[PDB]
C-alpha cells in the first residue's frame, strides 16, 4: 500500500496521477495534497481521496479553503507556504512523492522529498536543467530512487538495465552493457519549412510556450541536459534523434547492437502509472496502442542550422549549471516575446544566444543561487528583447 | 568465466556464437564442440579454441577428424554418437549451452542440457513445436535457464520484465503488467499480390525453406506456438503483427499502456551475444542501427485468408503437441513439393491441412513419441502430394 504526496495537485499532471489512485485504491492512498491558488479543485479533491493534509500558496487560500472544507465536514487539515510543501514532501509515512509542481516553486519541496530518501516520481524536468548537480548529489547520499515521469525520460527510463534502474544518476551505462540513449522528438512544425523562411515565421504557425520549444527544439535540448544528468550520461552517449510521428518516446541503444524502445499513446497516464507501480506495473485506463492505426514512422538526424537551441543547450552543459540554468530563464522571456510578436521567430534562438555571451559567473551550490543566475539571466534578456523592438 | 558446449558449431550460429566468443576471450570459453559430418570445419575450430572434447555424428567423420587433430597435435579428444552430444551437453563444468542442432537430431541433446540445469541459449526452434510440454516441464524442475535466440523471441524476452526472464515458462505474464506479447513478421513476398494470384505464385518468384513459410506466414505460425510456451502466453496474449522492413524485432504490450520492442539489424551475433552475456552485455561487432538509413516502417494485421497457415497453426495449437508436431512435420513435406515443383504455391496450406484432418492420434509424453507423430505426420503427407501430382 504506497501512500504518496502530489506536489502540484491542481495542475494537469496532478489530476492524472489522482486519475490512477483512483482505478487503483487497493495500491495507492494519498496522504497529502499540495496546491496553488485553486482553492476550487482543492476541495474537490480534498473530499474525494480526503488526505491528512492539504497545503495552499498563501494563507489567504488556506483560510478560504479550510472553510469550504469546514462546510462539508472534512477532516484534512489545512497549512500554507513553502516550508509546509517540504514538510509534506518529507512525511514519515509517505512513500512516494509527485513534483508536479513547476518553476521555481518546486525546487525546495523536490528537493526535500530527494533529501528524505523518498521515491521521487519526478514530473518537473525542469528542475534537472538548473540544479542538476546539487539534486544529483543529494540522491546520492539519500539514495532516494529517481523516476521520470516526463515522456521521454519515462521511455528512456523503461528500457535502461535494471540496475541501472535502481540507481539512477550514479550508475555507469558503459559498465552495463548501454552505449548511448536515444533522445527522441517530433521536430517541431517548421521540420521542413526552407531555412529562409523561418524568420517570417508567427506564432500562429507555431501554434502554449512548449509548441514554441518544440520548433526551435529548445525543448530537446533542455531534455538533452536533464538526461545527462538522470542518466549520468556524457556528451559521446547521447544521439538526439527526429521522429515526427512520435509514436516511440525514446530509445536506447546497447553493445551488441539491440535498441531498445518505448511506445504509446500520447496520454500522459501511462508514465505516470508506471512509476506509481514500478517495478511493478497496473491499469492507466490508457486505449492500446493500435498499430494499425498509424502513420509511418520516420527519423531523421537534427540539423544545427534549423535549429541552432539545440546546440546552444549542448554547448551550456559543458558550461555549467549556470549556463544551463540561464539559457532556461532567458527562453522563456524571448519565446514570450515571439509570441506577444515582439521579436521574429528567428530572434529567440539569436537573443538567447546573446545573454549567455554577455554573462559571466560561477556555478551556483544552492537553490538560492540557481534562483540569482535565473534572476539576471530574465533582467538581461528583458533588457535584449527591448534592444530590439 | 562462462564456459559453454555448443551443440552445431558448424552451422551459421554455431559459428556466430564462436564468433562472440572470439573477440570476448575474457568472458567466453569453450569446452566442448558438437558437430555433424563436417569434419573440415570442426578441425578449424578445434585448431582455435581448442576445447576439451569434440563429437561427431558417426564413427566415420569422427575418425578422419581424430585423424586430422592428430596431425595438428591437438589435444582434443574426439567421441561419436548421440550420446556422446548428451554427455556434451550435461558436462559438469559447463556453464551455457547453444542449443543449434536442429531437427529431431537435437531434441535429446537440448534435453539433457535441461534436465541439468545448464543455462540453455535455445536456437532450435523447432523444439518447443514438438516437445513443448515436455520441455518446459524440465525446465521448471531443473530450473534450468532458457534464454531464446531466435531473432523474434529474443526480442520478446528482451522487452519482458525481469522477474519473468528469470523464470521463463514459469512466470504469469498477467501478474507481471504484461497484457500481450506481439509477434512480428515481415508478411512475406505474397504481402500485397491479390489472392486470386497466390496459386500462379513460383518457387522462384518466393526466392531456401524460410522463404517459403515466409510467404505461407507457417513461419510465424510456427513462432506463434514456440512463443505461447516459451512465455506462458495464452491465445489472448498473443498477437501476430505484419513488419515489413522488420526493423522491430518484435515488442510486448503493457498494462499501463507503454509497448517495449526491441529493434537492430538482421545479424545474428546480437541475439547470440544477448543471451551469452545476460544479465550483462558485450560486443558482439554488430553494425550501429543507423535510424536516418531506414525505409519507413509501416504495421497491418495479418489476413487469414491470404495466409491460411497462420489460421492452422494457431488451430492446431488447441489440438495439442500432436497436431502441433504432426503440422511441423507435414509443413516440411509440402513446401519441398513446392519447390521441387510438384504442387501449386497454395497448396502448401491446403495440404498441410488435410493432413492433420486426415490423422488421429494422442498426445506424445517423450521424445520418441513426438519421433513418431513426425514419421507419420510425413507419411500422410508424401502420399498427399503424390495425390496431386
Known amino acids: ?45 480534498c ?7 492539504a497545503v495552499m500558496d498563501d494563507e489567504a487560500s488556506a483560510k478560504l479553503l479550510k472553510t469550504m472544507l469546514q462546510q462539508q465536514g472534512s477532516r484534512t487539515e489545512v497549512l500554507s507556504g513553502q516550508q509546509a510543501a517540504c514538510d509534506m514532501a518529507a512525511l514519515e509515512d509517505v512513500d512516494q512523492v509527485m513534483a508536479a509542481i513547476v518553476g521555481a516553486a518546486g525546487l525546495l519541496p523536490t528537493l ?13 524536468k525542469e528542475s534537472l536543467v538548473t540544479c542538476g548537480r546539487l539534486f544529483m548529489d543529494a540522491v546520492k547520499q539519500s539514495k532516494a530512487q529517481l523516476l521520470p515521469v516526463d515522456s521521454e525520460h519515462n521511455a528512456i527510463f523503461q528500457s535502461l538495465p535494471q540496475p541501472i534502474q535502481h540507481n539512477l544518476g550514479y550508475a555507469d551505462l558503459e559498465q552495463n552493457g548501454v552505449v548511448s540513449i536515444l533522445l527522441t522528438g517530433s521536430g517541431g512544425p517548421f521540420r521542413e519549412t ?3 523562411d523561418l524568420a517570417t515565421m508567427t506564432p500562429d504557425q507555431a501554434c502554449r ?16 541536459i536533464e538526461a545527462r544528468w538522470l542518466f549520468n550520461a556524457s556528451a559521446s552517449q547521447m ?14 541503444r546497447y553493445q551488441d547492437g539491440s535498441v531498445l524502445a518505448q511506445l504509446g499513446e500520447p496520454d500522459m497516464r501511462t508514465p505516470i502509472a508506471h512509476t506509481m507501480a514500478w517495478p511493478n506495473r497496473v491499469n492507466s485506463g490508457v486505449k492500446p496502442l493500435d498499430f494499425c492505426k498509424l502513420s509511418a514512422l520516420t527519423f531523421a538526424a537534427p540539423d544545427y542550422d534549423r535549429y541552432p537551441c539545440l546546440k546552444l543547450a549542448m554547448e551550456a552543459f559543458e558550461q555549467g549549471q549556470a549556463a544551463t540554468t540561464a539559457l532556461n530563464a532567458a527562453n522563456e522571456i524571448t519565446v514570450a516575446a515571439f509570441l506577444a510578436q515582439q521579436i521574429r521567430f528567428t530572434d529567440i534562438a539569436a537573443l538567447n544566444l546573446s545573454v549567455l555571451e554577455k554573462m559571466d559567473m560561477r556555478e551556483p551550490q544552492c ?11 530574465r533582467e538581461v534578456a528583458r533588457k535584449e528583447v527591448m534592444r530590439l523592438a
Request: hydrophobic residues 45%.
Open 112 to 124: 526535500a522529498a530527494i533529501r528524505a530518501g523518498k521515491t521521487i516520481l519526478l514530473a518537473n
Open 209 to 224: 510556450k512548449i509548441s514554441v520549444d518544440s520548433a526551435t527544439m529548445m525543448n530537446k535540448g533542455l531534455e538533452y
Open 367 to 377: 537553490v538560492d543561487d540557481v534562483l540569482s543566475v535565473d534572476a539576471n539571466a
Open 1 to 45: 500500500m504506497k501512500q504518496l504526496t502530489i506536489l502540484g495537485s491542481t495542475g494537469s499532471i496532478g489530476c492524472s496521477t489522482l486519475d490512477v489512485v483512483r482505478h487503483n485504491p487497493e495500491h495507492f492512498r494519498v496522504v497529502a495534497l499540495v496546491a496553488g491558488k485553486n482553492v476550487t479543485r482543492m476541495v474537490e479533491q
Open 239 to 252: 544521439e538526439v534523434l527526429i521522429h515526427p510521428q512520435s509514436v516511440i518516446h525514446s530509445m536506447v
Open 194 to 196: 526552407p531555412l529562409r
Open 47 to 53: 473530499l474525494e481521496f480526503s488526505p491528512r493534509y
